[PDB]
Design an enzyme around this catalytic site. Structure first.
Site: not given
Ligand SMILES: Cc1cc(S(=O)(=O)N[C@@H](C(=O)NO)C2CCOCC2)ccc1F
Ligand SMILES: [Zn+2]
Length: 514
Positions: A422-423, A426, A464, A471
């Site tokens: 997921h990261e 980004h 999410y 996101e």
């Molecule tokens: C579903 C999901 C949620 C998170 S998290 O629970 O870590 N939320 C953070 C995020 O998306 N980081 O990339 C947010 C938190 C608020 O600030 C921006 C990043 C991390 C990875 C992921 F796959």
């Molecule tokens: Zn994220």
């Protein structure tokens, strides 16, 4: 030898030391043991009427940047705020959170982001744990930052008396611990789903497999005699100190040990106590430096290993193990697994292209057990403490880095590998937007095209996924690369415009010229 005898002996060893404690050094140790909690009154009183009303309605559990403790304290504030509203109002004004999921409004997040600063307790042991001992990290008010520093320096100076060459090998010290304090992930599924009085053998082998060493960046408070586990205390540490480990005696048969010590996991077994199963952890105190050395070596190895696979110059610093806490070896071991899953699930050419883009900005993949606001890759580009975030994962464009925090739990993730993918989504979003416009870099998801696609398909995937365009793209990107085919299909199915948009952004990256 004799529980009461052990107690008396340790106490006597430390007796002169206890008698010499000033009323100041004595209030310090008490503050260390019992942190100063924020007064709910004071907080609520400081709010305006509108903020009270906001705090009153707001879906506290919807925030993705708050710890459970901060979420909970805030929920008591919420009750007190309405502690003067009809029963029906209260039942109603809370009986809609059931089918409640609404990534907060921007105006809600901003409010909470600031309120989070005012609801922190004064907690020396937490400060040390959160920063991994790096207490100058600008993750809190400068004035408070300095008080912590002073208290810590003051406590280090009190803890000057070693356990001794006579006692070290003649006594075991104990510590009860909540599994969720090391792995919030394994924690919520390491106690037999069916029979709670038992441990899942599959996970336990997991946990244990990679548990070789552990660090304490804070002051461990240990029991001279083993104490019966409480509620969520399924870990029972049995610790052996080194002849030179410094400690102080605490009333009621406890010892406070010096901060920054290293521990070697000697044995981990499943044992039975009072008809319930518990995990026994046998550890031995060793110099932290001897563990920091294993970590630095593991760092160099993982980078050389990947610099070759990804065809980068050997000396490239891509991967960073920012490790300071009690589940240290796992964080190191976890990084290997995650980067493997990443490679086994994403086209090699996507990996190389994006990873090269990060490398060109001196980016990093940071695997850590300290909170995200204390990782320079975030804090050097975020001066406002209220904008700093702690969470499972983070991608920081300004620094082209992926931060991944081991101990926490991410929203609806099966494992850390998935958080990582997921990261990386980004990062893909960043590169693609860049490729389109090197003279004015922006994120692909900021494109009018994707924005319209979001306004249409934005709610089709994970809850999410609805938070915002960025996101949504990252979540679709993650699902499109799951190890479970069903997930890959639902994206293409439930979100075809997104699926095609991402595959098109993947194709564009792959085709572009070096
Ligand atoms: C579903 C999901 C949620 C998170 S998290 O629970 O870590 N939320 C953070 C995020 O998306 N980081 O990339 C947010 C938190 C608020 O600030 C921006 C990043 C991390 C990875 C992921 F796959
Ligand atoms: Zn994220």
């Amino acid at each position: 030898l004799s529980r009461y005898e052990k107690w008396e002996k340790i106490k006597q060893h430390y007796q002169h030391w206890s008698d010499s404690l000033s009323e100041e050094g004595r209030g310090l140790l008490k503050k260390l043991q019992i942190p100063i909690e924020p007064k709910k009154d004071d907080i609520i009183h400081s709010l305006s009427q509108e903020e009270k009303e906001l705090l009153k309605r707001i879906q506290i559990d919807s925030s993705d940047f708050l710890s459970t403790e901060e979420k909970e304290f805030l929920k008591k504030l919420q009750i007190d705020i309405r502690d003067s509203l009809s029963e029906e109002e209260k039942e109603l004004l809370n009986r809609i959170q059931v089918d409640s999921s609404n990534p907060l409004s921007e105006k809600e997040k901003e409010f909470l982001k600031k309120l989070k600063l005012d609801i922190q307790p004064y907690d020396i042991n937490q400060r040390l744990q959160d920063t991994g001992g790096l207490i100058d990290s600008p993750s809190i008010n400068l004035d408070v930052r300095k008080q912590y520093k002073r208290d810590i320096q003051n406590i280090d100076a009190l803890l000057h008396q070693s356990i001794g060459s006579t006692l070290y090998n003649k006594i075991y010290l104990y510590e009860n611990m909540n599994i969720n304090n090391l792995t919030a992930t394994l924690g919520a599924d390491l106690v037999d789903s069916t029979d709670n009085t038992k441990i899942n053998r599959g996970i336990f082998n997991e946990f244990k497999k990679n548990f070789k060493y552990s660090i304490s960046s804070n002051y461990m408070i240990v029991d001279i005699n083993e104490r019966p586990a409480l509620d969520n205390e399924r870990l029972k540490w049995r610790i052996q100190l080194s002849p030179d480990t410094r400690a102080g005696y605490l009333e009621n048969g406890k010892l406070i040990l010096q901060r920054n010590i290293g521990l070697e996991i000697k044995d981990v077994q499943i044992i039975k106590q009072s008809e319930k199963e518990y995990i026994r952890i046998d550890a031995k105190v060793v110099p932290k430096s001897k563990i920091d050395t294993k970590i630095q070596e593991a760092q160099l190895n993982i980078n050389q290993e990947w610099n070759k696979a990804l065809g980068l110059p050997k000396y490239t610093k891509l991967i960073t193990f920012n490790v300071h806490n009690r589940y240290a070896s796992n964080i190191v071991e976890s990084a290997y697994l995650i980067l493997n899953e990443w490679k086994n699930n994403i086209q090699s050419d996507l990996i190389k292209k994006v990873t090269n883009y990060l490398v060109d900005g001196n980016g990093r993949f940071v695997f850590t057990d300290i909170t995200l606001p204390n990782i320079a890759e975030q804090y050097t580009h975020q001066d406002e403490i209220y904008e700093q975030v702690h969470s499972k994962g983070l991608y920081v464009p300004e620094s082209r880095s992926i931060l991944l925090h081991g101990p926490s739990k991410g929203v609806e993730l099966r494992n850390d590998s998935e958080g990582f993918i997921h990261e990386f989504g980004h990062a893909v979003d960043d590169y693609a937007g860049y490729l389109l416009d090197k003279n004015q870099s922006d994120l692909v998801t900021n494109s009018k095209k994707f924005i319209d696609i979001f306004k249409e398909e934005g709610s089709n995937l994970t809850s999410y996924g609805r938070t915002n365009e960025a996101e949504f793209f990252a979540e679709a990107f993650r699902l499109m690369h799951s190890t479970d085919h069903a997930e890959r299909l639902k994206v293409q199915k439930n979100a075809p415009k997104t699926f095609q948009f991402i595959n098109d952004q993947i194709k564009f990256i792959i085709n572009s010229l070096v």
